[PDB]
Amino acid sequence: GLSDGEWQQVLNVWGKVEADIAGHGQEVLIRLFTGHPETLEKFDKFKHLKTEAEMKASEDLKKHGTVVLTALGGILKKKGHHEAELKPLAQSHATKHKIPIKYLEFISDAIIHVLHSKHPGDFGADAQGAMTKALELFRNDIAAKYKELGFQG
Ligand code: HEM
């Protein structure tokens, strides 16, 4: 996947993320649910949100949003030595949450969108680089385990 240099850039940028996980976790999820309204239907818990406003005005989402960048954070610090921590993840989104690989494709772009909005001007090309190749690795390894289980949908 990536080289040390790129792993550097990845955990450096994770730097920005750790300084405010609930605010970053919140804007990503709000990035997803408004950009792609159908992802919202997957959370019985949030299907009740109708506006952007009502979304920001929600502590539960802020909460959920911290569970996620905390679980990702975990896997990203492994530097691709995540089967351990990803295996458990692959089966729940596959079998119980039932989330399509494209929905994992969307949120990935939303990470990168989100970081440019919040850090416009110090999220450069090399960084953008290595963060994308790490979200791809993550995304491809899930694919791999989603294949294993026939989650064709
Ligand atoms: C991008 C990386 C993601 C990470 C790190 C992640 C992390 C997690 C974790 C740790 C849980 C709780 C434990 C479990 O149930 O496995 C969870 C729950 C869940 N995730 Fe994800 N998730 C990610 C992407 C997604 C996406 C893209 C969607 C939907 C488009 C999604 C939908 C859900 C749902 C529906 C649940 C359970 C709902 C609830 O809390 O009642 N996840 N996620």
From Swiss-Prot:
Catalytic reaction annotation: Fe(III)-heme b-[protein] + nitric oxide + H2O = Fe(II)-heme b-[protein] + nitrite + 2 H(+); H2O2 + AH2 = A + 2 H2O
E.C. code: 1.7.-.-, 1.11.1.-
Keyword annotations of the record: Cytoplasm, Heme, Iron, Metal-binding, Muscle protein, Oxidoreductase, Oxygen transport, Phosphoprotein, Transport
Protein name according to UniProt: Myoglobin
Main location group: cytoplasm
Subcellular location, record wording: Cytoplasm, Sarcoplasm
CDD domains: Mb (cd08926)
Species this protein is from: Equus caballus
Encoding gene, per UniProt annotation: MB
Residues given in the record as O2 binding sites: 64
Annotated positions binding heme b: 93
Domain Globin positions: 1-147
Lineage top rank: taxon: Eukaryota
InterPro entries per UniProt: Globin, Globin-like_sf, Myoglobin
Disulfide-linked positions: none
Binding site for nitrite: 64
Enzyme class: oxidoreductase
Subunit description: Monomeric.
Positions bearing Phosphoserine: 3
GO CC field: sarcoplasm
Alphabetized GO MF terms: heme binding; metal ion binding; nitrite reductase activity; oxygen binding; oxygen carrier activity; peroxidase activity
